[PDB]
Subunit: 170 residues, 10 copies
């Protein structure tokens, strides 16, 4: 059952990620101090263009300049993530990417987030906005066919940051 | 415990809504054949301006022209709902509005949609997109401070409708 | 399930009440050393004339001069209560009032007093007389359509105070 | 546990009453088609004057002209009810009375109405208003030292009858 | 369920009795150091003449000269016990009596002794013989229409006392 | 646990009894249409003089002439009962007797009548008056050291028969 | 349920026995240091001759000379036991006997040894050999008709004692 | 738990036996019509002389002439039984034998008879006399060191046969 | 908990496999009437040379000349399987292969065969020989560092088919 | 239920084995610090030639030159194991052997290793490679008709020790 609740500490996670083409151990707690956009995508190497992970990567500075990091996660292995990264974009690969790719091979992370699909063995499109004190502020769940918008995510982040500081004015 | 699941029938509801300044029984199944934007807001008559309900209200034809209805919901009674509509925007009301205000006084619907706050007694900002077959496609949950964007809700509705046809 | 039992400590409650147009946290224990008439009413902003709430506020000194306070309560938010007070009596509103309007938005207080209606999501008309030691002396429960009497409530209070002191 | 709940069928009862000096079997359903004021008092033959039973007695035709009956109950045996009635008022008795005294010897009725005091073996003073279709409309429970009022009871009954017929009005 | 068992401590009781026309608190343990004939009868103020309470009354000094007390009990309130005593015999009353009438208003005592009739709310006629150390020596239960006998009771008590002292002999 | 309850069917029993020096199966239902005094005694062959059993047998006609039978019972085997009858009264034995001695060797009958002593493995002195319709009217239980009276038992029986017919 | 198991401590018992025509408390632990033959028989005073008890009685020194005692047991009371001993063999008694007769009136011991017959209320023909350390070595259970042989019981006792020393 | 009860149908068994040096399937029901002596012994091939199985074999006609058969059982496999039989007696083997050797490899039979030893994985010395209607008449259990006597078994069989016919006379 | 049990039918499985570069739906029963070597390997794209899968592919004809198929499986998706087949060996891919690569993305197959490593989220090295009637004949489980042998697998398959005929 | 799990310590076992013609008490931990090939075979004295046990015995030095011991086990008693070793091969015995034959007479070892056939009462053909730290590294289960290979077992042992060093 899902552990993700708005207003509660986002469920702890840790696992191996690909970070600049190397295997690094990564933990939710590594992000304390900053806002974190933590999103799940269904699988590496499919025949859909990975335009949403690419979008977040390409516009990463828009998050980093407002104290926000981005982490992406699927149930693939770190070895698969690596291979997808080292596959040229023009070839359906992801190409180089500046956002970590977290592996959830055991499926524990996805279950903890309520994004796992029992019958498919992968996640749906799930996005989580977690604040600098590690509290969960926002949950977005999309049925598989529909992607997330970087612009919408940015709006939400800036809005949580505004109201953390100033309250709701009006 | 929450019955709302992506890809499954959105969980059934019925209640009283204020529609065009009158009480009506409104059911989920009323919307079968149309996409539905179904969203919850925390309370009537607070000191925060109802910006999001007004935007969905004013830009309603935009959803109607792509075969979509909108329904807003909170735990307030339908009487409070009618009073808030009858209060002029100037003095802190909503003023006339083109979207039904559903009353979830019993809390059952909020509970069924997983948006209910046990400690507070009202909901968080929860939004749900329900297809013309009554299937839940999308769940958006915000912590109280932050509201919803019509543009985003537009984009998503169009994207679900696009891929229904073309995948 | 109900905790209210004659001759036992009235069940504890606390919450946000509208007192003289401000939000204030209010606890049952604020009333120690005084009698308290504690009563539930079903909803703000209905079409029923609120004559029974108005009568308790308007005759509040009849209670204060025999060491009794009065607190009213419904499942409505404090925001709704405040908006109801800010609506003039001539318009269906409550107008200014001298009694706290306590909010039971989570429903807990109503469930503890056994006055909550699961099917409706609000209370019936329930009244509780609590003594200065916080013991419950009298429970009055009415079906929706019929309200309470300040005269009867005064008789009960004077009688408990007379038998508390005499035979 | 109590089965008395507003706007549900008043809990069924039956038992022996003293009616005009005779034992009669009496049932809640005997009263269908009229309003019923059903009330409990603590005991016969105590040293408290029975002002309130007498008052309802003295004023019965006020209830009857509005299609309403009154029944009193305690946990005393019907034999005690009878002796009490047969004892002159001037000697701590009740004397002649026009209302049925129902006996709740088994205590079941008291329990069902939630008026029963486990530690004492008798009831507190409870009063119940049941409509013509057996639905419970009103519950009044007083701690032991404070009695009921015919006037208040009449008001409630007339208001229930008035609203049954005309709904809620100003 | 009954707690009365031969050769075990008679089940504890306490309650209000009428003793020489006054309310007294009375406890089983008040009787330690003597034999006790403890007996239950069905109700006060019925139309059956109270031959048996009167008989034990009339003959009390026979029990007392052998270090033995008698207590009567029904489920009636002590207020009823008192009114019954205060009602002249010639009017269905008991008149003056020399034995304590214990009240079992809560029904707990009746239940503990297994004399309680759930369907009637009162007791059948049971009689119990408790020795000087609180141990139950004898249980007699009669169906409602048949009374007890002082003579038999005296015989039993004298035989218990005789065998306590001299054991079993011929 | 005990099945014996005043105003209910006496509990069923059956077993081997010694009747006029022969083994015979005996059932409670053999007694329908007659009163039955059914009684337990602790053990055969003890040093207590068996005066109470002897008295019921010796005064058996006092019961038979008011339509009453008597059956005695203990946990002893029928073989032991028979040997006890075959021992002369002058030697501690029972001598010939006119009442069945019923054997409760398995203990079931005693447990059903609530007269069995777990610590001892035998009964106390228990007596049961059963009417002609097989309803239990009277239970008498004595501690070991003290026996029953035929006179008292006769009074009880005559009284049940008198109130069965009259007031 | 049966506690008797080969190789484990034989299950503890105590009760009253008739030993040399008097009542004595007899305990299993009384026999510690000696082998014990512990056997049950169905009932006293039956019409079958007590051949087996008499044989064990008469040939007792044979066990005593190899450090063995014998104890017989049935569900009869110790009073029946004493009466059966006091009845002359001629008339169906046992006559004087050199072996204790244990009484298992409560049935606990029979139950503990698995020899009790629930339907009958007495035991079958059960025999047990218990070593000087209180360990059960041998269990012999016969259906009612058939009795035990002293010679066999002798052989077994000697065989256990032989292998205790030499294996 | 053991299923063997005196006076009840002896627990059903079946398994492979060695019968005249061949593997035959054998069942308790094969013996209906006759008395059966069914005994367990601890193991094939030990360093104890198998003098008790040999004894029963050697004197088999003493059973067969009074309508009685004999079956022996251990937890060894039928292959081991065969090999023990084909091992010359003078060599610690059993030699040829006219009594079937039943294998209880799964231990079910021994458990059903209450003769199994959990801690050893074999049986103790157990003997069962089962009559011609398949009822169990006799149980003999010996601690491992001590054997059974053919003479005693014969006595028991003849005695059950006598009393089946004539009752217990006396 | 594992369902794979020798002499029992092999646990049913189904899923997507890559066969000759294409997604095909594959199930255990597609193999009824042939023997099946079903093996698990830990993951696609690791840095360990894939010698064992290549070895079976190269030697497929030896299996097929004896009525035997080979199927490999890991917890990686069919998509990853395709990408690995499509990556030239010299770059750590598998290259073209003649053996179906089954995907166990839900992990249900691995669990059913008892090869799943709950801590790592992938299988160990498991191999199963399933006969032409669906019956599991052989189970081989290796700790991760050590591979399987084609020669040993052939020996086993031939021995099973040899004994199916000749005993 | 089986306790054998790869990468976990092998299930503890102890029992009597025949070693060099003698009963010796043997346990898993006697092997700590060496690798152990532990295998099960179905029964002593069957008509099937015992080729696999002989083969390992003949080739023991190959195992011992690489710090490895071999132990065989079946559910037969140590006594049967001795008789089988003591029976000349030409008569279907095993003849002299260099490998301990462990007895699993209680069946607890076979169960713990998950090789026990509850319907037959003996094991199937199971082989276990346990490393020098007591950890289970490899499990091989064969259906009864098919034996193990020494060459394949050597290959596995060498591969495990090779990877323990060099990865």
């Amino acid at each position: 059952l899902s552990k993700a609740k708005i207003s509660k500490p986002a469920p702890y996670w840790e696992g191996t990620a690909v970070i600049d083409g190397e295997f690094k151990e990564l933990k939710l707690t590594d992000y304390r101090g900053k806002y974190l956009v933590f999103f799940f995508y269904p699988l590496d190497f499919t025949f859909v263009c990975p335009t949403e992970i690419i979008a977040f990567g390409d516009r990463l500075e828009e998050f980093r300049s407002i104290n926000t990091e981005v982490v992406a996660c699927s149930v693939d292995s770190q070895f698969t993530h690596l291979a997808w990264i080292n596959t040229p974009r023009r070839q359906g690969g992801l190409g180089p990417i500046r956002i970590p790719l977290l592996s959830d091979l055991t499926h524990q992370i996805s279950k903890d987030y309520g994004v796992y699909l029992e019958d498919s063995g992968h996640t749906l499109r799930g996005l989580f906005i977690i604040d600098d004190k590690g509290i969960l502020r926002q949950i977005t769940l999309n049925d598989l066919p529909v992607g997330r918008s970087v612009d919408e995510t940015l709006r939400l982040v800036q809005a949580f940051q505004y109201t953390d500081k100033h309250g709701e004015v009006c």
